[PDB]
From Swiss-Prot, chain A:
Name of the molecule in the record: Large ribosomal subunit protein bL20
Role played: Binds directly to 23S ribosomal RNA and is necessary for the in vitro assembly process of the 50S ribosomal subunit. It is not involved in the protein synthesizing functions of that subunit.
GO biological process: ribosomal large subunit assembly; translation
Keyword Lyase tagged: no
GO function terms (MF aspect): rRNA binding; structural constituent of ribosome
Family: Belongs to the bacterial ribosomal protein bL20 family.
UniProt cross-references to HAMAP family, sorted A to Z: Ribosomal_bL20
Keywords: Ribonucleoprotein, Ribosomal protein, RNA-binding, rRNA-binding
PROSITE patterns in alphabetical order: RIBOSOMAL_L20
Signal sequence, start to end: none
Superkingdom of origin: Bacteria
Transmembrane segments: none
Keyword Metal-binding included in the entry's annotation: no
Curated annotation (Swiss-Prot), chain B:
Biological source species: Escherichia coli O1:K1 / APEC
Domain of life: Bacteria
Protein name (record): Large ribosomal subunit protein uL4
Matching Pfam families: Ribosomal_L4
Keyword rRNA-binding attributed: yes
Cellular compartments per GO CC: ribonucleoprotein complex; ribosome
SUPFAM superfamilies, sorted: Ribosomal protein L4
Region annotation Disordered: where it falls in the sequence: 44-71
GO annotation terms (biological process): translation
InterPro entries with a match to the protein in the record: Ribosomal_uL4, Ribosomal_uL4-like, Ribosomal_uL4_dom_sf
NCBIfam families: rplD_bact
Protein's UniProt keywords contain RNA-binding: yes
HAMAP family the record matches: Ribosomal_uL4_B (MF_01328_B)
Lineage start: Bacteria, Pseudomonadati, Pseudomonadota, Gammaproteobacteria, Enterobacterales
Stated role: One of the primary rRNA binding proteins, this protein initially binds near the 5'-end of the 23S rRNA. It is important during the early stages of 50S assembly. It makes multiple contacts with different domains of the 23S rRNA in the assembled 50S subunit and ribosome. Forms part of the polypeptide exit tunnel.
UniProtKB/Swiss-Prot annotation, chain D:
GO cellular component, one term: cytoplasm
Keywords: Ribonucleoprotein, Ribosomal protein
Subunit structure: Part of the 50S ribosomal subunit.
Protein known as: Large ribosomal subunit protein bL35
Length: 117, 201, 144, 64
RNA sequence: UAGCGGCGAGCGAACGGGGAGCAGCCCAGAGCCUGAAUCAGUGUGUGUGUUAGUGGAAGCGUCUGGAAAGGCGCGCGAUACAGGGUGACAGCCCCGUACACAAAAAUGCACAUGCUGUGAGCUCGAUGAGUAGGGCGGGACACGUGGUAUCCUGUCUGAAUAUGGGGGGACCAUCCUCCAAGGCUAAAUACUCCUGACUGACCGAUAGUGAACCAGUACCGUGAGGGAAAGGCGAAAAGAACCCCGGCGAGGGGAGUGAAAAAGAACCUGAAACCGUGUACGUACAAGCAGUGGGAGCACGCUUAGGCGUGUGACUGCGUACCUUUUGUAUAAUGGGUCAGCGACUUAUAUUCUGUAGCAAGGUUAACCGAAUAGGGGAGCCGAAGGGAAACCGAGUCUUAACU
RNA sequence: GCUUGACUGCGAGCGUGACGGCGCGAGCAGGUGCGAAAGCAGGUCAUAGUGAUCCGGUGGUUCUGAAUGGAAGGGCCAUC
């Protein structure tokens, strides 16, 4: 029972050469190079799934900082004031109000100002 | 237990330990796969690196040429070289214990009775050794794929069933585990039941 | 029961150990052999009893005894084997005909193993003290 | 083919009732004046092969 | 296993048992005898094969299709539904197959049968001499000189000869058994250059023979010798009449054949590396394993005219390949130019242990017989009893004069 | 001063060792030596003073003894 490898090796090489679409040079048309590119892209995607949640909280904090300082309070005092006032709105929403509802944010900064004072 | 006879409407008594025991799928399977293994001819062979035609001259010197070292034109790595683990003619037959082969048949016969696939007749033959005869005989009995077990090998019945693909005519001593399962229905003459009664004991 | 519906018992057809067929199989690369030893070579491995050059156990211990040719032609007979004979005579010849002792055994001894429940006569076979009591307790008799 | 017994081991080990092996004690062949009688007396009876060395003996005696 | 063994590596019987197959004889010589059996050659038959061959059943309509053997419907043969071909898959189209027949000539085998040649029986005998044995040196015996029997002999010797001699594993006595120094002998056994038939959980063009092909060829070597690559149009050549550009070229565009020419002979399918043409997007102030997370803009498909999908990816955070070997590699340590095909834990036997199955103090046969994957075959193997070096004893035994 | 316990054959139980092994050991027999006897003596205050296995040598032996009786050889015990 001799087994020929032509059909299944063709499909296994095509399987990851399709995953290497858009890569530069041999990384998108040469199997040996494309396998390393596909594996490395898998390692990067796994770790950037976990540091996408950091890069976005950094963005939210920086925007809450910028908006709070326009209302006369820093980020650190703003968050501390919100905890004292028992406001559970998180950074994703706080940074959303800061951009799309300027009146609500300043009505929300005054909530933290009263809690601290 | 007893088996009803379609031909004569009488009854025939048989041992419960032969035609009435539980099905042993694990045991029946081993005997069946060991029957198919004994049908293998097992005649085949490839050439090792010692049997490929060619000389033992080293293709190129050990060092200095810049090529990967080689020692034989017949290395299995090379094309037109030897096969690494080239096969030999081998015997694939397995040993089946006597108490298992008989034990497997008893489970097969018992399961045929439970599935209404074993039918017993008083006698089964054809007047002339003509294939058209038992072809008509089996239409009357409403049988298409059938194995006929006869007490004595009937020459007319053997010749008249030879050209029918879905019909097999044996004798009570020519019963095998595979053919009992491989056929839709099994027809045993009352003489044949007695012989397998005293063969399977 | 069809030829394509009968299957083996659960756990009776353990699959073989395929060695060196990728990372995921757990047996790829070295194939259970480790790295860079004599035991990892094709055909490598030390013989039986070799201990690295230290005098092996089967050579630093002394030989003892001799093989007795009389024990090769002497057998032992159990009480449960006395009923296997035909005719109620447990002699040296009636005991080979029952396939109890080898065809070339010349001395047999009946020991207390099993039990005697029928009267038998034992000619020419040595009988232990325990077996003599049991043979005579079943109505049998022992003859020199 | 049949495994070959290590004939040297078959002359030094005998298998007992429960699968162990008995062997003759070493140090009792010569140089015996300088050995105390207590040392030689304890060295006369046969001993059993230890747990560590059973693997090396079962290998050498496949038909034990 | 017993043994042999720097008692190491290893080597490794026989007795006995079960089977296949069985077959016995005549020259050491004379009497009658009588051409007597068994035999070799040759002819004559009588059969049976081999070397050519002969007959050999039974199907039509309709649908798709280039084409029917396919679908559907209704029939028939079958001791023939093995196989192959035919425009797709045929029991009934063809060749065959089952079966039944056939030899002028040559020839194998088996009987009968004459002729030629040797010889059957009874009595009386006789009983293989430089031989057996020995010394020295070697070799074969499972046996390596060992306490070493036995066999062979290169060299020196050397009997008895049936009232005798050999062997029974140093050797002696007794006993048992056999008769060397002369020969012949079928079957069971081994193999396949070659012939025929059939088969394959064997390969299918880098495989299988080195060789599917004009292969032991081309080619290499002084030579012995080494030794390739290379298969497929189509059902049928119907292998492209004719016209046009071109050098009365190569090559191509039409025409035509064909189901199909993107089946056009560099011819089934036609992958990947590699190289181009076209389109969309990005790209000439910008630094690095070239990706990944975020992300505008642009183009495009929308079928709720709805946001999404697809292509690209300005900018931006993070980010020094893979394998191997290592304490540790981006390492400037190894390996890899890329693609495609091939390439490495197998097989046989034995032993031990797990899972599973059958029987169970029993289990199981091997060879072989049997057409029998049946059935027979229990020769044997393992287990139910161990202790001791052993005799021996025995649920005990060894140790010791004896053990609490 | 007298002596030979520098005994014979076993040893519950322990310590060390991967193992081979190497230690310590009270107690049981059998026979002793010292002491009036309670006792203690199985070498030396202790820890080095050593060499496995194979192969053979010597003495003993209720073992074995290749047809049988012996024997050779082997085994076991002591020892080189
Ligand atoms: Mg194939
Ligand atoms: Mg591409
Ligand atoms: Mg050479
Ligand atoms: Mg090849
Ligand atoms: Mg059988
Ligand atoms: Mg692992
Ligand atoms: Mg390695
Ligand atoms: Mg190493
Ligand atoms: Mg290792
Ligand atoms: Mg090798
Ligand atoms: Mg050394
Ligand atoms: Mg027997
Ligand atoms: Mg000694
Ligand atoms: Mg025989
Ligand atoms: Mg014809
Ligand atoms: Mg015809
Ligand atoms: Mg049409
Ligand atoms: Mg049709
Ligand atoms: Mg076609
Ligand atoms: Mg001679
Ligand atoms: Mg001699
Ligand atoms: Mg010797
Ligand atoms: Mg002799
Ligand atoms: Mg002689
Ligand atoms: Mg003679
Ligand atoms: Mg002769
Ligand atoms: Mg001859
Ligand atoms: Mg080839
Ligand atoms: Mg091809
Ligand atoms: Mg030339
Ligand atoms: Mg043209
Ligand atoms: Mg010109
Ligand atoms: Mg032209
Ligand atoms: Mg046309
Ligand atoms: Mg095409
Ligand atoms: Mg085609
Ligand atoms: Mg083509
Ligand atoms: Mg392409
Ligand atoms: Mg621009
Ligand atoms: Mg600048
Ligand atoms: Mg720019
Ligand atoms: Mg740059
Ligand atoms: Mg920079
Ligand atoms: Mg993204
Ligand atoms: Mg970076
Ligand atoms: Mg490497
Ligand atoms: Mg280093
Ligand atoms: Mg690093
Ligand atoms: Mg370097
Ligand atoms: Mg490097
Ligand atoms: Mg390199
Ligand atoms: Mg490579
Ligand atoms: Mg291996
Ligand atoms: Mg079980
Ligand atoms: Mg103890
Ligand atoms: Mg006194
Ligand atoms: Mg002192
Ligand atoms: Mg001192
Ligand atoms: Mg030595
Ligand atoms: Mg020696
Ligand atoms: Mg004796
Ligand atoms: Mg004798
Ligand atoms: Mg003798
Ligand atoms: Mg002696």
């Amino acid at each position: 029972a001799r087994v020929k490898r032509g059909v299944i090796a063709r499909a296994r090489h095509k399987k990851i050469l399709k995953q290497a679409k858009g890569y530069y040079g041999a990384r998108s048309r040469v199997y040996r190079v494309a396998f390393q590119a596909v594996i490395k892209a898998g390692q990067y995607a796994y770790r950037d799934r976990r540091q996408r949640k950091r890069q976005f909280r950094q963005l939210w904090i920086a925007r809450i900082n910028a908006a709070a300082r326009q209302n006369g309070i820093s980020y650190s005092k703003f968050i501390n004031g919100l905890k004292k006032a028992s406001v559970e709105i998180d950074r994703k929403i706080l940074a959303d109000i800061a951009v799309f509802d300027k009146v609500a944010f300043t009505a929300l900064v005054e909530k933290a100002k009263a809690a601290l004072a | 237990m007893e088996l009803v006879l379609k031909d004569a409407q009488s009854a025939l008594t048989v041992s419960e330990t032969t035609f009435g025991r539980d099905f042993n799928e694990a045991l029946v399977h081993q005997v069946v796969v060991a029957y198919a293994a004994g049908a293998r001819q097992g005649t085949r062979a490839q050439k090792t690196r010692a049997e490929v035609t060619g000389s033992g001259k080293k293709p190129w010197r050990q060092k200095g040429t810049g090529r990967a070292r080689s020692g034989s034109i017949k290395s299995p790595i090379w094309r037109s070289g030897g096969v690494t683990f080239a096969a030999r003619p081998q015997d694939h037959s397995q040993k089946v214990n006597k108490k298992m082969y008989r034990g497997a048949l008893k489970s097969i016969l018992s399961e045929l009775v439970r599935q209404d696939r074993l039918i017993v007749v008083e006698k089964f033959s054809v007047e002339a050794p003509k294939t058209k005869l038992l072809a008509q005989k089996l239409k009357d009995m409403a049988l298409e794929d059938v194995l006929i077990i006869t007490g004595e090998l009937d020459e007319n019945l053997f010749l008249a069933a030879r050209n029918l693909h879905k019909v097999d005519v044996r004798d009570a001593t020519g019963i095998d585990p595979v053919s009992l399962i491989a056929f839709d229905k099994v027809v045993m003459t009352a003489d044949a039941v007695k012989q397998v009664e005293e063969m399977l004991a | 029961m069809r030829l394509n519906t009968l299957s083996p018992a659960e756990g009776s057809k353990k699959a073989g150990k395929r060695l060196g067929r990728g990372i995921g199989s757990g047996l790829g690369k070295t194939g259970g052999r480790g790295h860079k030893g004599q035991k990892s070579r094709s055909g490598g491995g030390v013989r039986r009893g070799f201990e690295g050059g230290q005098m092996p156990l089967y050579r630093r211990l002394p030989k003892f005894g001799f093989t007795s040719r009389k024990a090769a032609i002497t057998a032992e007979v159990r009480l449960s084997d006395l009923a296997k004979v035909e005719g109620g005579v447990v002699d040296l010849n009636t005991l080979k005909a029952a396939n109890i002792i080898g065809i070339q055994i010349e001395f047999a001894k009946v020991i207390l193993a099993g039990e005697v429940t029928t009267p038998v006569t034992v000619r020419g076979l040595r009988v232990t003290k325990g077996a003599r009591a049991a043979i005579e307790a079943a109505g049998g008799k022992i003859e020199e | 083919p049949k495994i070959k017994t290590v004939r040297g081991a078959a002359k030094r080990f005998k298998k007992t009732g429960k699968g162990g092996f008995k062997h003759k004690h070493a140090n009792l062949r010569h140089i015996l004046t300088k050995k105390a009688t207590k040392r030689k007396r304890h060295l006369r009876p046969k001993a059993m092969v230890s747990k560590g060395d059973l693997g090396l003996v079962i290998a050498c005696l496949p038909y034990a």
